RNA sequence: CUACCCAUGUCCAGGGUGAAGUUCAGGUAACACUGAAUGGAGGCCCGAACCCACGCACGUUGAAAAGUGCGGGGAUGAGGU
RNA sequence: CGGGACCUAAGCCGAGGCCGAAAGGCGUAGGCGAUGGACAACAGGUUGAUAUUCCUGUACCACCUCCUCACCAUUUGAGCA
RNA sequence: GUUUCCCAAAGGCUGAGCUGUGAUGGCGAGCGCGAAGUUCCUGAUUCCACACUGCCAAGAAAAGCCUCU
RNA sequence: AAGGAACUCGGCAAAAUGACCCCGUAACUUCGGGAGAAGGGGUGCUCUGUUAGGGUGCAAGCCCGAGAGAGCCGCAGUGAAUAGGCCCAGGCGACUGUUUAGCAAAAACACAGGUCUCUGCGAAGCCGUAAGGCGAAGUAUAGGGGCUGACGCCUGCCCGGU
RNA sequence: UCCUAAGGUAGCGAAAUUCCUUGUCGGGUAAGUUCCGACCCGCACGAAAGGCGCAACGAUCUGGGCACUGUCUCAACGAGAG
RNA sequence: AUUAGCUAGUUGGUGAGGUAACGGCUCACCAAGGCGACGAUGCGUAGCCGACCUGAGAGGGUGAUCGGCCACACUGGGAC
RNA sequence: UUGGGCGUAAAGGGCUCGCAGGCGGUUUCUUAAGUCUGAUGUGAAAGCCCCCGGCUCAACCGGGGAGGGUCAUUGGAAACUGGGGAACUUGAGUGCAGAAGAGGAGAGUGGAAUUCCACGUGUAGCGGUGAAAUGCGUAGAGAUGUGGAGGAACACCAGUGGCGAAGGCGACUCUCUGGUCUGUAACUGACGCUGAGGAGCGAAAGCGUGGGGAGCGAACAGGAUUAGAUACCCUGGUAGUCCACGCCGUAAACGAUGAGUGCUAAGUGUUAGGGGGUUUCCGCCCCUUAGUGCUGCAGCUAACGCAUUAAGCACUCCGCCUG
């Protein structure tokens, strides 16, 4: 957050200005969720976080499966650089 | 002797039964979950030694001032000495 | 080896001291007390009775130099513990 | 005993057995004498050994020992 | 032999069942069980086999013997000894445990859990007229005492007398 | 309507309690003073002297059915020990 | 759907036999598949169809007679 | 279906996250599954139906024809739908720059007030009602002064005010965390909407284990009230509420309105922005996104009412109703 997506915005650059292209988005969702993951571990009580966790993680499979039908290659290089699955 | 108790060594043929886990596979955003294998817990089961007296029979100037005979209940723990 | 001159728990005996209707339970110190720990040895004969003891073989165990060889050192002076 | 660095296999303590001796013996079926005296298989309740792992009810002491002054 | 509980306080006694492999298993259930429920089935010998296969070994050979096909035998085929009788409900105790040495093994005691209360540490309670060192090399998530008995649903009324 | 300090609620009920009794009514049997199912004119059930219901358990304890049987009508014979 | 799990000759392969004929149709072997929320399996129900009746049509009800076909011949099984 | 509904008449699931299934922005190439259409083959006959003829007409019977098929093959059509290939950026999303917040969870922090208790001071009652009694009191209450424990509630701000999807959340501060809205344009190039089952949340009551229990308070008790009072009133009063953790998963879980997309006079406040017009201003005025309320036109409605926050006109999806 605000560091680190300094380094990802800069990490899954096709073009030079990519600031949607969504290979980006998954990479601020999925450290996003990482970051969210272990505050739930610290409080399970909390349920009002776990409203943003559902659309995070609908986000993310929308994303995924989105990859799925126009770039085969892509979509799957995505995966082996983040373990998702 | 016995009743508990204190320190101390010691014994219990084999078979069954299979949890908590574990790992792998699947599964889930991730834990829940699922299936295999593994692992082997139990005042767990069946049954000898070994304890123990329930049920009849025998005994009753008995083999014996409490037994033997044919079978019976516990038998890795609140155990037996 | 089995038990002593090895140790020790359970428990007991217990200098003083705790200044107890007389006695007397016995309090630490200290030491008893083994079923424990510690420890050097077996394998073959043998009579009418003993046998990891007698005998024949073959071993170790601590202890001691009448000694022989070594090495180190007699005051940082080896060695003992 | 802790506390800091330096190396991550070596070392030690351990041991059931194994083989060589021990055996130029002693036993040994058999008639005081004495032959061959191997290999394979089975296989523990004894040994490594409370060694390992796991569980929970949290499983003596002191002296031989070894070391320090 | 025929008969099966008519015997009898009552299936007391006695027979009947047992072995291992394989198929199959109800109600209820606290999901662990109940269950080996029940209910039946095949087991011997000889040949395809020093077997399929394993163990073991360097091979040689030894042990382990799966399934079938074949076929012979008697009435029988764990032939001997010897190792569960099962099913339906019912109260009472939850349960394994313990006592009436030497009449009476349970429906009694114990039991986990519940629970009200005492007790601030030299606790309370106890031994018993002192000590001393149990409780406890413990400290209210601990230790005595009483009342019930796992778990599940529950535990209402009366403070006048004691 | 008198009397109490207060008058038994939940669940059970001829009960290991129940006298009259073998209560009555139903299944079990040709026949069932025991046993189970319900009835409540609970003599004298009742809530930690605990109340009820409970799968697993018992050399407990009552009742029923199969299997198989000298237990019995109805005795018989054989071995052995007196 | 107040029936969600069901099937081991089941489902596959190979060969064999068998049938006028294809085949797990039968058997050996080997494999573990197949069937399923588009509703399997199950259960109650019932012969189907051109057509009949009704409705303005879309549909709904019935499947008697006459015409098509299957199944059955006291109940069940086999075979010439 | 052609040929209904859902504010109150029977009916919106409490709300969400979403797999399957359902539906699709714009431009262009292509394909022909759907679709359109020819040809061929066929849907026997009787019957219906078109038209004749026969029986004394009729009924009946006969002749001819049509019709009946989500039919098959074959050949055409390419707009729309499905499929494939390629572009555009408004839908939706990302960046970046802002702004609002009682959104959640966590450990801690106070301030009045209630009671309790310690004590001074102080005397006959206070306490309570429609009236009064029970309760409390010479053992010193009530009132009053300081001090002490302890819990739970968080005035004022407070507002058809904020935010969440709903239930819901109001002392304060910190840590941690969700979404929201504006500003464009930097990016992606339809990536979206809805969603049976499935998943998670869901006030109060209740449940199980402990913690804590000051007010308050079912059950019960007492005093009245009353013909009766198992009630309203009355003084007490147990569980509870309270906390951590686990479960139940229901309500008028209400906007009695299922979610999204566009469109359709106004006027008006009000919460957060943004743009401008003279102005540093304050301000006024105007344009403009977003919820938030009220009075209103067309139309909808059976009437009340609803009216850019629809119950208007349309469409995609899910639930529900048939006295």
Known sequence: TQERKNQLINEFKTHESDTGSP??????????????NEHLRTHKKDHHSRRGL??????????????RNKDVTR???LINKL???
Request: glycine share 6%; no cysteine.
């Open 23 to 36: 290979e980006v988005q998954i990479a601020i969702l999925t450290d996003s969720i990482n970051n969210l």
């Open 54 to 67: 559902l659309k995070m993680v609908g986000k993310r499979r929308n994303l995924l499966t989105y990859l």
């Open 75 to 77: 979509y799957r290089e």
């Open 83 to 85: 373990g998702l699955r």
